[PDB]
Symmetry: C3
Subunit: 415 residues, 3 copies
């Protein structure tokens, strides 16, 4: 039974979290059982029942329209280098990453800046964040962080509650970090889409990341102390421009990091290839090692053993490098001309498991940005780095288990 | 048939009227200043378009800068290789023109070029000459004269740098004159950008020079000088800061600055064009063929007709002028150059194309307010609240200035020039 | 066929020029300068003459060439098919897009060196080579570490290892740091020259000879007249991924600044050539070639090719090495009209391998001041003299090259 394989996976994830908990006898049951109940509720809502799949389908239509609007600005700026004739000439190379993926960071950063300026995002965060604190009993600040994290990046997310950060507790801070590592940004989300990644999965994952982030944040470090209970751009054109420039230099940083990471990985594979020549192989790669290593974890979360090696590589690459490298090697399996055709339930698991910033490199990003908001807490942030990555990774896997289960029930994923 | 003078003088009268009606103190208006500015602007406008000797000078200047832009393209050809080559059109067609590779690098080169010209001492002299001419004829203060004269060549934030010890304690009318002169003007860097997009270069040069008196015109009309202009002896100019080591440093530094500027503009344009199409999606979804371009056009259609555009082509000019004010000139020009193509479905009259060219030539938009507020505060932090207050008024001042030159354009492009 | 006299002639002239421009010729440490000259010509004879050394140099060339290939994988990922071979089937000569072929190498090698700094490899290489230079030349530990570091990294990143010692270091030590930076390259832009076409083994050798050559003319122009510090230490990113990412971002904005500088410089040069060609075929290239022709002849270039080498070296000093190399690789094509000898191609490749130009003065002033702001006045004052020192160093390695080729 699929439900047995999924419930087992959920059991493993929750068990590992408790074993890594700082105070196991201090764990708030109402919070974590409520959080787990919400994440699986949203899971059943968007992936199982027809009404929710239609609502999710309408959302995909809307945001894709927005992405298309962004591409109008991309077509204007980069002319025919993003035209259709690129494939007619360069074939697969017709898809230029730096011109089709990175500019979406620029557009959405400006769009989010406009939405913040109008007052739309404050409303959405206040509503969703309010629902969380009312159900889970978490504080207001860490709750608002999760809602922001659904839409914006891990660094931009706590900005809405940034004066509360310098005084907030150990658990509240970790919850902000975990909620940050569990969720992507809307900017890079459209980036994944332009690479070929299924949009509806990314939407659902972004919403599930908020309670899932809180789930493993209250499991690893439950609230042991007292909380703190309480309660600019010139014009709209300035906000749009300010967001564009911000998203521009972010995109340059992202594009430069990927160019370096990919090249370094190939360099490592060259080293492992030579040294591994005496090990009886020589054709060994880092991808295979990660896949062979993370193979058990892939099988636990619902992936068949035949594809557990593949899923292991993608999950492995995600944590040690980033999600972009993972998704870049993942879309290669989504091609209809692929030698190895993945199952539908597998693709859903991976799509949810990979949707997160939880990696070794995001730690320094957290440290830098979260310190600018709270400099005296900088030592605390860097200390909770690894544990937060774990919390974020477990949140992604929880969403993956839930996803693979509901696709095993009534399946759906267009090629 | 020579009724154009009536239609033009009407437009001139309307533009000056709107200014006077929006003035802070109508009885404080210095007639010798505003009549001088209007007379100078129409004199320059006539001279370069009308008389043969003036057309030759504008043509000589055009050929000079055209060669400069060509020199810049050598660097572009070097850096981006064949992505800016001729066979880009043989392959991609119209899409062979890559805006990021054809336009933005010109911002880099000219920013480095102007850095060299400021280093040799050339630009300080030109500003000192033209600025001195404006304080003699218009009676405006020394500071606002240098700023207005500077704005002809450089940007709105870079221009007041030559008078930055004056900015701290200058009056509102002077402060408003600096802001207006910056909004009614362009930058030589982005000017070369418009040229590559297809915009007529001679019109740009003419509009750039008319920006200074036209700026001071509506600056002294909206906010006249009711206080004392500072004298040199009373001002102590706080020291120094960086001066570039040598000419190679100056060129390299200016290039890097122009590079990050080109990045900021490029990203802003990607966002703006996208957000515009997103608004068209919202409107088109709520309303069907209704777009923001059409609304802005239908809205500014009368104002387009006032300045001398035929009603058949008034809707188009309305969209372009509209898009300029609410977004920027790059978006306006990008839509304008499509009407300049020989195989274009919609064909405009020669006089209309000129009117639009001059009307669009200016930084007068809602975004430039925040640009001024930022850069002008770095020079004088105590005046930041005052700058932000006069933001909208100054944009209007810049708009009226650009429109005034456009009226003059249509009037003297009302014959056989066609430069 | 004994150009050994012509080479020794070149060495003599260069050293003589250095001595004449010195502050205190009576304070020159002979053991230091003769040692530095001895080491530089020893390295030359090792990697360019004797078989066992050419092999090691060839192996290092092969290794780094593989590293470069690994970097291109990341480049192929980012910029897709605009770096494919189809570009040549379409655009031909223009298929080679500089901004896409060369600049991203700076990003990759700035991240890689950041990793090597993180692992602890570079700290070891600096400590070993630096200790070798303080023992043989008698130079202070700090200025030896900086010179050794300048082999791998840039002029502003090299003194970062001896950063706390810069505030209290002497006039001669400071100049030696500046000279070491101007006489040397970075591994980032080194891979950039390789992608243009410039022979990798020459770039390898030149980068290693840069350190003792820099120390040579630094202790010649301003010898140590004060008391120094004896012992010195080499001496943060959260993890290796942070270091690799940070190095990439730094290299990115660096690549932006470099590319923009080239676009301007190239365009400004074409503008000057347009001014000169006015009525009221002479170019800035030819003029600089006409001026630096004698100095090109002294270092061992045949007079028939002295005009060409003069332009290239001339452009290097007044503009930069990228502009110089970009017009030098045109002579390395088999389809070129003017062919050059193998010895000349080696001479120019070594002479142009350095940041020593008029524009690098401001770069030194900027970065070296961030490390020691009270010494900013001293750095700017010694700017031109340091450019001379770096230039003479590159010329020395060029003489050594032309000598040991054959
Ligand atoms: C729902 C949104 C469900 C999203 C999950 C609708 O929320 C209501 O949206 C419109 C807003 O106006 C309403 O203010 C907003 O309620 C969620 O329904 C209720 O919304 C409340 C806040 O949005 C949440 O519970 C509340 O409990 C207390 C007051 O009712 C307070 O703690 C605080 O207002 C809030 O936590 C909760 O989502 C639910 O009761
Ligand atoms: C090391 C990089 C040093 C950093 C340069 C830093 C550069 C700073 C100047 C070099 O990295 C890798 O080293 C291994 C040697 O263990 C090379 O092995 C190669 O061996 C054969 C080549 O002759 C062949 O099997 C393959 O090319 C490869 O396995 C790797 O190529 C090399 O990347
Ligand atoms: C925008 C939504 C912003 C959501 C932030 C999204 C936040 C992402 C994190 C607004 O989205 C637009 O909504 C309208 C309806 O309100 C849709 O109408 C129609 O637009 C087009 C008409 O030409 C048509 O192609 C579409 O099919 C039709 O829906 C727009 O599509 C939609 O973009
Ligand atoms: C942004 C605008 C700034 C323009 C500054 C340069 C123009 C100087 C000018 C026009 C100035 C009036 C602008 C007015 C702007 C109002 C819109 C005309 O000068 C002409 O310059 C060119 C180029 O230098 C000369 O030709 C040369 O071009 C190439 C560069 O040297 C070279 O390859 C060619 O061999 C060479 O021919 C022209 O000879 C020169 O005339 C100065 O105008 C003055 O006008 C006066 C009246 O005739 C005279 O005095 C004389 O002609 C000349 O000095
Ligand atoms: O808005 C963003 C986008 C990216 N990143 C960082 O960049 C990596 C690649 O997108 C992510 O994993 C994350 O560490 C952020 O912190 N915020
Ligand atoms: O040198 C420049 C170029 C552009 N801009 C700003 O960027 C907008 C688009 O060019 C202009 O309207 C102006 O606000 C400047 O301020 N200075
Ligand atoms: O790592 C580097 C690379 C370049 N440059 C500066 O940039 C110029 C062009 O590469 C060089 O001459 C030098 O002045 C540095 O300072 N450090
Ligand atoms: Na997020
Ligand atoms: Na201006
Ligand atoms: Na160096």
């Amino acid at each position: 039974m699929v439900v047995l394989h999924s419930l087992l996976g959920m059991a493993v994830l929750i068990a590992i979290a408790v074993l890594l908990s700082t105070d196991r006898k201090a764990i708030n049951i109402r919070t974590v059982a409520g959080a787990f109940l919400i994440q699986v509720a949203l899971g059943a809502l968007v992936l199982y029942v027809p009404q929710g799949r239609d609502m999710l389908g309408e959302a995909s239509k809307t945001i894709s329209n927005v992405i298309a609007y962004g591409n109008n600005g991309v077509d204007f700026l980069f002319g025919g280098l993003v035209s259709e004739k690129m494939f007619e000439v360069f074939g697969g190379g017709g898809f230029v990453f730096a011109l089709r993926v990175l500019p979406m960071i620029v557009f959405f950063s400006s769009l989010m800046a406009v939405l913040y300026y109008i007052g739309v995002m404050q409303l959405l965060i206040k509503v969703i964040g309010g629902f969380l604190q009312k159900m889970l009993g978490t504080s207001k600040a860490e709750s608002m962080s999760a809602a922001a994290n659904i839409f914006v990046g891990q660094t931009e997310a706590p900005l809405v509650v940034r004066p509360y950060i310098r005084r907030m507790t150990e658990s509240e801070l970790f919850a902000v970090m975990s909620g940050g590592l569990a969720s992507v940004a809307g900017s890079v989300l459209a980036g994944y889409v332009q690479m070929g990644v299924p949009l509806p999965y990314l939407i659902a994952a972004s919403f599930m990341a908020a309670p899932g982030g809180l789930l493993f944040a209250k499991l690893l470090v439950p609230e042991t102390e007292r909380t703190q209970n309480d309660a600019k751009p010139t014009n709209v054109i300035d906000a749009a421009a300010s967001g564009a420039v911000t998203g521009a230099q972010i995109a340059i940083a992202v594009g430069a990091s990927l160019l370096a990471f990919v090249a370094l990985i190939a360099m490592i594979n060259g080293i492992i290839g030579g040294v591994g020549g005496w090990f009886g192989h020589g054709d060994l790669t880092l991808q295979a090692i990660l896949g062979w290593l993370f193979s058990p974890l892939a099988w636990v979360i619902g992936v068949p053993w035949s594809e557990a090696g593949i899923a292991g590589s993608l999950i492995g690459q995600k944590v040690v490098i980033n999600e972009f490298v993972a998704y870049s090697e993942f879309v290669k399996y989504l091609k209809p001309e692929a030698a190895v055709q993945l199952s539908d339930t597998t693709k859903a698991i991976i799509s949810f498991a990979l949707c997160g910033f939880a990696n070794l490199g995001s730690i320094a990003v957290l440290v830098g940005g979260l310190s600018i908001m709270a400099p005296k807490r900088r030592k605390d942030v860097a200390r909770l780095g690894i544990k937060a990555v774990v919390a974020g990774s477990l949140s992604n896997l929880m969403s993956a288990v839930i996803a693979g289960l509901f696709t095993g029930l009534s399946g759906a994923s267009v090629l």
